[PDB]
Design a protein around this nucleic acid. Structure first.
Lengths: 205, 82, 102
RNA sequence: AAUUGAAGAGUUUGAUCAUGGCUCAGAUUGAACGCUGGCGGCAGGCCUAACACAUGCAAGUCGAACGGUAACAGGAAGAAGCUUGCUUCUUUGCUGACGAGUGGCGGACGGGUGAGUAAUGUCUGGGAAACUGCCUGAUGGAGGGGGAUAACUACUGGAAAC
RNA sequence: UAGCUAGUAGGUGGGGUAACGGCUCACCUAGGCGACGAUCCCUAGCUGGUCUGAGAGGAUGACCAGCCACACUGGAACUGAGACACGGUCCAGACUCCUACGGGAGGCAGCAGUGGGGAAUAUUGCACAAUGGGCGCAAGCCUGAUGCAGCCAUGCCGCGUGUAUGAAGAAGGCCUUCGGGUUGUAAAGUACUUUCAGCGGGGAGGAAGGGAGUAAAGUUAAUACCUUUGCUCAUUGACGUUACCCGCAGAAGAAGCACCGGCUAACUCCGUGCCAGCAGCCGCGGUAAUACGGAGGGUGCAAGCGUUAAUCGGAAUUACUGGG
């Protein structure tokens, strides 16, 4: 499991930042955006109609940090449900436990959020939860437990957390290292980056 | 002959019993006349877990069916009231 | 040659002792020729007289075996190690492949 | 409260449009092989020779059906050795039991396999000219007699089975 | 494969079966089945289902469950409620073993396991603790059913092999218009966290029951006795160094595989020179190979990856829906 590789290469290949590093500063100097990685990336791509679909699949998958088989399972569940499949896809991805920790701002990065849920810092409704893929419900309190409370790991994160624009579907809390998940994301609440018919289209063939 | 008995369909190291009316000759997993309840011994803190339609069990006792010792214990556990 | 190249203590025996035409001195002298194990020294050998068909013995052979096992110590590990060499290996129809291990 | 869904491309010709085959992108398996491989959950694991098989194990169980001691586990009685209060050792089915045996019930179930079978089969919907130990409801009898036979003893044919 | 049927088709009577019946017999009549595919041959266990498919359809019947058939080969009956009987029986045949060679014994298409077949599929394991059977009043005994473990990345699914900061844009590699670019925040360095493994502790649930003592009711001559319903006291775990929880140490123990000419996401140099070889398809290579071999860079996917075989799809390419 996990990507494990160099983080900036994925942002540079996709041509828009995926927020993978991005702790202390949103630094231009390191990123080298839109120049592409490797020797021959300088040339204009002139991308295909298949490739723009395949690129958008990777662009979404690399944000949440999922692998294709686990990502396929979310697509199968999103398809059988009534209403738009792309929206029900992004709802299940946003409903991940490692994702909510990043949204509450307990962790600095999505990889550090997955590390904290794996390392059994995070508790949901007073259960500890190892599994990152775990599907959060409406009406779910979430919190850090005593062993991981007030360490250098959480303390540095809560400082840089203030900069963010702040989600509309959850209550932030966090005066005492907890948070509350109020209600479902909808298409307006979540970002405008994703082309939602397009990612669903690729699985049709 | 007809016997009221517990058949196990549940997963490995988590038995979930199906109390059922069947002939004695047939294997535990095998051929049966009808289902009548369920019994989860592993259970959970939820209220549901032992269930048995008494109008069915008293009917089969009236037709002369005999009762396996666990099901006999579970009937005298649930009674009208436990 | 197999006795010297494997560094092995060696004992010999006269087979045809019953016969008077099968005299021990012909047997004793004719294998005394070699550059290892000459005979009639009373050292580096022990001589045995055994009947071919009866047979006769076993005290003299037993004494020769006992003296070589007394002259050089023989021991074996009795815990945590099992080892040895293979004599013969074969296949049996009912039991499968088997092997005789010393 | 409820049963939502359909992609194409390459390749005949100098080039084109048809007709038309071949091939590929998809999903999948009771899989195999190659390279590589940390842990866990759950499920699966001789599809070929219904080809042949060593060894161990896979059906017995009731003394509350009965003769019985073949046991051995005690008691009781009794005889001894003396330590006169004890071990020892013969009797005794008296007993807790129980081999072999008679008799009861089970061995037709549970389990394996896909050889044969294109209709004595299977599946679906109906029927009458039937049985059904074990399991139940209903109503009554359960009286009085006899002859065997295995076991066991006494012998004996047989290499062994018998 | 176009004609096939004498108990064949029908009736009466006798016999037979639990019971209908050409079921089986005697006698009588001449029919029966047949192009809506008889008969014969080849091939095949069937179905609830599985797999694929938008559906219609197609392919298929492992696992799970229902049913039938078979039990070394061939045939028959007994006992029994039920068998023409997998580990019952009798006889014949094949074949293996034993033998005093006259005559006897044996049937893993039960669980393990071995020979052999084959591309290829496992431990000569533990326990009746649990469910369910067999016997028994019951204790209890028996149960390779079943519950469990061992073994294999075989499949599905989950998780990890770190996280953050970090320009010196390091060293080294590769390319270069020899100006540089790239590998590359990757590294190194610094700051943090230790899941799962490793090591030491603690510790659910699967157990309801059954047993021995007691009280009451029912019971009867009876307070017996026995059965039932309460109660108390002793207990009952194969799996099991169980699940699960806590503690310790330290980035420590843990990433490979295919592909990069078009189809089809992802490029240059060097070696070889129509040779060597690649190739799913159209095709590449005969001195500047983005297709071969090697290296660098890149892309896909993950404890798997790829190839091959097998099935359906695309295929309206058997077209009913849906063609000529």
């Amino acid at each position: 499991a996990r990507y494990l590789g160099p983080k900036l290469k994925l942002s540079r290949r996709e041509g828009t930042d995926l927020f993978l590093k991005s702790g202390v500063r949103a630094i231009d100097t390191k990123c080298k955006i839109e120049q592409a990685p490797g020797q021959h990336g300088a040339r204009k791509p002139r991308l295909s109609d298949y490739g723009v679909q395949l690129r958008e699949k990777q662009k979404v998958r690399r944000i949440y940090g999922v692998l294709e088989r686990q990502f396929r399972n979310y697509y199968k569940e999103a398809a059988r449900l009534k209403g738009n499949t792309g929206e029900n896809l992004l709802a299940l991805l946003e409903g991940r436990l490692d994702n909510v920790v990043y949204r509450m701002g307990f962790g600095a990065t999505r990889a550090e959020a997955r590390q904290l849920v794996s390392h059994k810092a995070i508790m949901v409704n007073g259960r500890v939860v190892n599994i990152a893929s775990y599907q959060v419900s409406p009406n779910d309190v979430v919190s850090i437990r005593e062993k991981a409370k007030k360490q250098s790991r959480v303390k540095a994160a809560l400082e840089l957390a203030e900069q963010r624009e702040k989600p509309t579907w959850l209550e932030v809390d966090a005066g005492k290292m907890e948070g509350t998940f109020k209600r479902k994301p909808e298409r307006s609440d979540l970002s405008a980056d994703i082309n939602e018919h397009l990612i669903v289209e690729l699985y049709s063939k | 002959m007809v016997t009221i008995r517990l058949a196990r369909h549940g997963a490995k190291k988590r038995p979930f019993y199906q109390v059922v009316v069947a002939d004695s000759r047939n294997a535990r997993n095998g051929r049966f006349i009808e289902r009548v309840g369920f019994f989860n011994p592993i259970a959970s803190e939820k209220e549901e877990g032992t269930r048995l339609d008494l109008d069915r069990i008293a009917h089969w006792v009236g037709q002369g069916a005999t009762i396996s010792d666990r099901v006999a214990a579970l009937i005298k556990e649930v009674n009208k009231a436990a | 040659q197999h006795a010297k190249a494997a560094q092995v203590p060696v004992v010999v025996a006269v087979n045809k002792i019953d016969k008077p035409e099968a005299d021990p001195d012909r047997v004793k002298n004719e294998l005394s020729q070699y550059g290892i194990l000459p005979e009639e020294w009373g050292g580096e050998s022990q001589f045995v007289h055994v009947s071919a068909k009866a047979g006769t013995g076993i005290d003299e052979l037993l004494d020769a075996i006992l003296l070589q096992a007394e002259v050089l110590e023989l021991k074996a590990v009795r815990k945590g190690m099992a080892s040895g060499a293979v004599i013969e290996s074969f296949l049996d129809k009912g039991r499968g492949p088997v092997a005789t291990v010393l």
